[PDB]
Amino acid sequence: PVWKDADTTLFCASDAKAYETEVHNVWATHACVPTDPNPQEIHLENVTENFNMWKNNMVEQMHEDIISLWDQSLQPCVKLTGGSVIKQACPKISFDPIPIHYCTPAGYVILKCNDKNFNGTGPCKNVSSVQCTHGIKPVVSTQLLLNGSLAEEEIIIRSENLTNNAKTIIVHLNKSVEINCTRPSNDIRKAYCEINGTKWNKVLKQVTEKLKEHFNNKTIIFQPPSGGDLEITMHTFNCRGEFFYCNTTQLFNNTCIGCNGTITLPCKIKQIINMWQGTGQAMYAPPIDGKINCVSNITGILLTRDGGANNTSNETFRPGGGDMRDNWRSELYKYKVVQI
């Protein structure tokens, strides 16, 4: 019953249905094992551990998989990679991320912080031990984190160094905000997302107050990104295979804290993407026919605070994204690998 921080090679578990053609099911059928049918965590009594979500290998462990997963599934007609043009087959596929678990091999375990207000760094008091993590959907997105877990109590602000403006801030919402995005049946690339103005605005209000506590009640200001390539300037995600690019100016720019209706963001489905796995562009074919719809829960926000504001009374925050390791860090933050 003693251990030390260490890294090893993990394996995955998921409930992939062997028959299903959906790319995540297929990727998990041949690369992951069946989920533990008999899990049991082991509370360690009055044991206090330290965690660090910004420096956790599990996150790089998951990243590598999703990159492998996307490489063998979601695959472009043409891939441009620093002066190369590999052409390929690019058939429309079935895409809907499932949860995947991360388990340790014999000789190690994962420590799971259960402080409902854990921020991801430092000390944790109620510490549990698990063999595998819970089911995590590997949802790829910028600006908004969708379909994830929620914070159990207060909205949590996660960062490696709040004081360093270069380090990303992950907001962990305690209440989700539904976001419905549709590309109507037959511009075929035109689409949009609908969001409750009231709900979203109340949540953003609350978020503002949280950041207030972390930044000496200094005026909090939200704005959209200042410069970017579209993947970052817009809220980007994949819905049923298609890459959606939505303009979130109406969430971070009306402030509005008579505005309380249904926010409607304009989006566009882009065949040509700047990849997240590695630098390069990938070009897909045009969209599939019929209404393409994905309703998702917004569960977190990726923010970047402005710099050089030290001499003012304001703090400016803009939605960020691009590095997916932060998206995985969004769910894995409470886990840590220790060798027995």
Ligand X SMILES: *[C@@H]1O[C@H](CO)[C@@H](O)[C@H](O)[C@H]1NC(C)=O
Residues that bind ligand YZI (CB under 6 A): 140-142, 229, 231-232, 236-238, 243, 273-276, 278-279, 322-323
Name which of ligand YZI, ligand X, none residue 27 binds, using a CB cut-off of 5 to 8 Å depending on partner kind.
Answer: none
339 binds ligand X (CB under 6 A): no
**What one-character-per-residue DSSP string does 7-65 give?**
----EEEE---TT--SHHHHHHHTTSEEPPSS----PBTT--EEEETTS-HHHHHHHHH
- Contact partners, residue 19, CB within 8 Å, separation at least 6: none
Q: Which does 273 bind (CB under 5 to 8 A by kind): ligand YZI, ligand X, none?
A: ligand YZI
How far is the C-alpha of 170 from the C-alpha of 304, rounded, in Å? 9
Q: What angle do CA 215, 326, 170 make, to 5 degrees?
A: 25
Distance between CA atoms of residues 175 and 116, nearest Å: 14
Closest contact distance (angstroms) between CB of 254 and ligand X is 7
State the Cα angle at 150 between 42 and 51, rounded to 5°: 50
Stretch touching ligand X by CB under 6 A, among 67-75, 85-93, 147-155, 270-278: 147-155
Q: Does 322 bind ligand X (CB under 6 A)?
A: no
Nearer to ligand YZI, 14 or 233 (CB): 233
* Residue 265 to residue 203: CA distance in whole angstroms: 18
CB 217 to ligand YZI: min, Å: 34
181 contacts 245 by C-beta, under 8 angstroms: no
Q: CB of 140: closest distance to ligand X in angstroms? A: 8
Q: Minimum CB separation from ligand X for residue 239, in Å?
A: 6
CB 77 within 8 A of CB 88: yes
Q: Which does 217 bind (CB under 5 to 8 A by kind): ligand X, ligand YZI, none?
A: ligand X
The site for ligand X (CB under 6 A) is made up of: 43, 96-97, 114, 119, 121-123, 126, 128, 139, 146-147, 154-155, 157, 159, 161-164, 174-176, 180, 182, 194, 196, 198-199, 202, 206, 210, 216-217, 224, 233-234, 237, 239, 247, 249, 253, 262, 293-297, 308, 310
